[PDB]
Enzyme design. Structure first.
Site, mmCIF file in Angstrom:
data_model
loop_
_atom_site.group_PDB
_atom_site.id
_atom_site.type_symbol
_atom_site.label_atom_id
_atom_site.label_comp_id
_atom_site.label_asym_id
_atom_site.label_seq_id
_atom_site.Cartn_x
_atom_site.Cartn_y
_atom_site.Cartn_z
ATOM 1 N N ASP A 140 0.807 -1.230 0.000
ATOM 2 C CA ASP A 140 0.000 0.000 0.000
ATOM 3 C C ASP A 140 0.842 1.284 0.000
ATOM 4 O O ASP A 140 0.513 2.276 0.671
ATOM 5 C CB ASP A 140 -0.953 0.020 1.201
ATOM 6 N N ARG A 144 0.217 9.210 1.004
ATOM 7 C CA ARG A 144 -0.446 9.309 2.328
ATOM 8 C C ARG A 144 0.229 8.380 3.338
ATOM 9 O O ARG A 144 0.127 8.587 4.540
ATOM 10 C CB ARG A 144 -1.929 8.947 2.225
ATOM 11 N N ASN A 145 0.940 7.375 2.837
ATOM 12 C CA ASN A 145 1.708 6.447 3.679
ATOM 13 C C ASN A 145 3.191 6.761 3.819
ATOM 14 O O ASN A 145 3.982 5.929 4.265
ATOM 15 C CB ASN A 145 1.495 4.999 3.200
ATOM 16 N N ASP A 158 3.169 2.014 7.797
ATOM 17 C CA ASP A 158 1.968 1.205 7.517
ATOM 18 C C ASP A 158 2.208 0.124 6.465
ATOM 19 O O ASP A 158 1.351 -0.154 5.616
ATOM 20 C CB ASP A 158 0.785 2.098 7.143
HETATM 21 O O1 LIG Z 1 -0.554 -2.893 11.621
HETATM 22 C C1 LIG Z 1 0.346 -3.451 11.018
HETATM 23 N N1 LIG Z 1 1.478 -2.857 10.492
HETATM 24 C C2 LIG Z 1 2.001 -1.573 10.745
HETATM 25 C C3 LIG Z 1 3.197 -1.225 10.145
HETATM 26 C C4 LIG Z 1 3.772 0.015 10.345
HETATM 27 C C5 LIG Z 1 3.122 0.909 11.180
HETATM 28 C C6 LIG Z 1 1.933 0.547 11.788
HETATM 29 O O2 LIG Z 1 1.256 1.374 12.670
HETATM 30 C C7 LIG Z 1 1.122 2.708 12.326
HETATM 31 C C8 LIG Z 1 0.818 3.082 11.034
HETATM 32 C C9 LIG Z 1 0.687 4.417 10.730
HETATM 33 C C10 LIG Z 1 0.864 5.380 11.701
HETATM 34 N N2 LIG Z 1 0.703 6.750 11.412
HETATM 35 C C11 LIG Z 1 1.576 7.766 11.879
HETATM 36 N N3 LIG Z 1 2.693 7.464 12.552
HETATM 37 C C12 LIG Z 1 3.490 8.460 12.943
HETATM 38 N N4 LIG Z 1 3.342 9.772 12.778
HETATM 39 C C13 LIG Z 1 2.213 10.068 12.107
HETATM 40 C C14 LIG Z 1 1.712 11.337 11.730
HETATM 41 C C15 LIG Z 1 0.529 11.140 11.049
HETATM 42 N N5 LIG Z 1 0.316 9.790 11.003
HETATM 43 C C16 LIG Z 1 -0.874 9.240 10.382
HETATM 44 C C17 LIG Z 1 -0.740 9.040 8.901
HETATM 45 O O3 LIG Z 1 -0.076 7.790 8.798
HETATM 46 C C18 LIG Z 1 -0.127 7.324 7.451
HETATM 47 C C19 LIG Z 1 -0.589 5.900 7.513
HETATM 48 O O4 LIG Z 1 -1.932 5.935 7.943
HETATM 49 C C20 LIG Z 1 1.336 9.103 11.639
HETATM 50 C C21 LIG Z 1 1.158 4.994 12.998
HETATM 51 C C22 LIG Z 1 1.290 3.654 13.314
HETATM 52 CL CL1 LIG Z 1 1.656 3.173 14.937
HETATM 53 C C23 LIG Z 1 1.360 -0.688 11.580
HETATM 54 N N6 LIG Z 1 0.288 -4.786 10.685
HETATM 55 C C24 LIG Z 1 -0.821 -5.641 11.072
HETATM 56 C C25 LIG Z 1 -1.051 -6.740 10.055
HETATM 57 C C26 LIG Z 1 -2.314 -7.511 10.387
HETATM 58 C C27 LIG Z 1 -2.166 -8.130 11.750
HETATM 59 C C28 LIG Z 1 -1.859 -7.058 12.800
HETATM 60 C C29 LIG Z 1 -0.611 -6.279 12.429
#
Ligand SMILES: O=C(Nc1cccc(Oc2ccc(Nc3ncnc4ccn(CCOCCO)c34)cc2Cl)c1)NC1CCCCC1
Length: 297
Positions: A140, A144-145, A158
């Site tokens: 993805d 935006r990511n 993400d």
């Molecule tokens: O969940 C994951 N993987 C995964 C992998 C990486 C990260 C992640 O978590 C995050 C994702 C996005 C963000 N966002 C932001 N972080 C920091 N500073 C900012 C400022 C604005 N934002 C928002 C805008 O961000 C753009 C994205 O939306 C921010 C925060 C977190 Cl913590 C989850 N795998 C799953 C697979 C299925 C089984 C369970 C696990």
């Protein structure tokens, strides 16, 4: 051959969720503050609250996934700071104070020079190359990511499931056959570049999402951005070839864009060449003893 990544397992009352930021396939992201107990520090964080696992096996695999996130270590990929083992597990990462790159380019379209655009193309490619080296498919990648730590420094976030729809970002083979690979990530990288070079235009705008596969198979692609020389645009086009193995590898994209970032004026033509999210931190929150997760760790 050890892995000494440190996993911090934190109680949720050490955090204050200020507000919701967004939602995706795996749950909900908050803006928050980590206030470790018995300290005088409030640390800017993002907290992703995962939706509840639908089965015991999938609950287990949340932890396998967190194992993978805590071992990801590159300046251009987000890094796990810790987790909270509530029934719905929470992932804690450092807040990127300028928000996502898509919003940053939209807001500042009159004040971004060729140097910054090309550098971001480099750094994102370094981040995807790192993820490929680790055998992680993003699935993805879109502007935006990508997150802005400082104008000079962006991170990919993400990323997808370690062990396994944005139609207008998807490689053809992902649309038709649900094939996601590093080469399909290259396709998305090309679209992400196009977003940056258009200062956040929506790709194939007007074209319904259900016509994308047909349009692609028929040879149509995203148009040349006004600021792009045919040189930069050709790099994009190469990411959108129907043959996945014909696309540039991320390691080649690091080189190409680095070459271009030596003489950015040759490559992007912007007039006068020679954050809403930031301001919300300045306003919509208590800001007394705030300190980066850089200084604390
Ligand atoms: O969940 C994951 N993987 C995964 C992998 C990486 C990260 C992640 O978590 C995050 C994702 C996005 C963000 N966002 C932001 N972080 C920091 N500073 C900012 C400022 C604005 N934002 C928002 C805008 O961000 C753009 C994205 O939306 C921010 C925060 C977190 Cl913590 C989850 N795998 C799953 C697979 C299925 C089984 C369970 C696990």
């Amino acid at each position: 051959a050890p892995n000494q990544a440190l996993l911090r397992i934190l109680k949720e009352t050490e955090f204050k969720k200020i507000k919701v930021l967004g939602s995706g396939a795996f749950g909900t992201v908050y803006k928050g503050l980590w206030i470790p107990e018995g300290e005088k520090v409030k640390i800017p964080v993002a907290i992703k609250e995962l939706r509840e696992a639908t089965s015991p096996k999938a609950n287990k695999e949340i932890l396998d996934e967190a194992y993978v996130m805590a071992s990801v270590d590159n300046p251009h990929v987000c890094r796990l700071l810790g987790i909270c083992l509530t029934s719905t597990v929470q992932l804690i990462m450092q807040l990127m104070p300028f928000g996502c790159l898509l919003d940053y380019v939209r807001e500042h379209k009159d004040n971004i020079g060729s140097q910054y655009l090309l550098n971001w193309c480099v750094q994102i490619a370094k981040g995807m190359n790192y993820l490929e080296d680790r055998r992680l498919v993003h699935r993805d990648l879109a502007a935006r990511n990508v997150l802005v730590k400082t104008p000079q420094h962006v991170k990919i976030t993400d990323f997808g499931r370690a062990k396994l729809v944005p139609i207008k970002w998807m490689a053809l083979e992902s649309i038709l056959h649900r094939i996601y690979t590093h080469q399909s990530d290259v396709w998305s990288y090309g679209v992400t570049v196009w977003e940056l070079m258009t200062f956040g235009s929506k790709p194939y705008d007007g074209i319904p999402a259900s016509e994308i596969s047909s349009i692609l198979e028929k040879g149509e692609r995203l148009p040349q951005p006004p600021i792009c020389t045919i040189d930069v645009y050709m790099i994009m086009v190469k990411c959108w070839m129907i043959d996945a193995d014909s696309r540039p590898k991320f390691r080649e994209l690091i080189i190409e864009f680095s070459k271009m970032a030596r003489d950015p004026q040759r490559y992007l033509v912007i007039q006068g060449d020679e954050s809403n999210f930031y301001r919300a931190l300045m306003d919509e929150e208590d800001m007394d003893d705030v300190v980066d997760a850089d200084e604390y760790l």
